[PDB]
């Protein structure tokens, strides 16, 4: 029982990350002279939860 | 004699204003296209800063 649940919160833990991982190469990916670059609403806001290092 | 000396020395100056004015019309000329390029150059950097929160 205790191996079957630890395995399953890992998973949960790799596909949580991946995601970021897309999302930051996406990131870095984008540049000027692109179609999605324009002026976003006060997105100087800090999140509100904001887990630290 | 004299008056004609004065005129002498007004064309000189005209010529060289002249010629200073078009120097700085290029001048700013160049500074606008340098506005444009700042804004874009923000936008871009707007949206970078924006994605992070999804």
Same mark, same amino acid.
């Given at each position: 029982?205790? &191996?079957?649940?630890?395995?399953?919160? &890992?998973?949960?833990?790799?596909?949580?990350?991946?995601?970021?991982?897309?999302?930051?190469?996406?990131?870095?990916?984008?540049?000027?002279?692109?179609?999605?670059?324009?002026?976003?609403?006060?997105?100087?806001?800090?999140?509100?939860?904001?887990?630290?290092? | 004699?004299?008056? !004609?000396?004065?005129?002498?020395?007004?064309?000189?100056?005209?010529?060289?204003?002249?010629? !200073?004015?078009?120097?700085?019309?290029?001048?700013? /000329?160049?500074?606008?296209?340098?506005?444009?390029?700042?804004?874009?150059? *923000?936008? *871009?950097?707007?949206? /970078?800063? !924006?994605?992070?929160?999804?």
């Amino acid at each position: 029982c205790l &191996l079957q649940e630890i395995r399953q919160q &890992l998973n949960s833990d790799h596909r949580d990350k991946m995601e970021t991982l897309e999302i930051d190469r996406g990131c870095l990916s984008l540049n000027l002279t692109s179609p999605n670059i324009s002026l976003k609403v006060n997105p100087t806001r800090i999140p509100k939860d904001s887990t630290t290092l | 004699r004299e008056m !004609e000396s004065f005129y002498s020395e007004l064309k000189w100056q005209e010529k060289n204003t002249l010629e !200073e004015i078009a120097e700085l019309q290029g001048d700013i /000329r160049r500074l606008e296209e340098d506005l444009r390029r700042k804004m874009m150059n *923000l936008k *871009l950097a707007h949206t /970078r800063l !924006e994605s992070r929160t999804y």
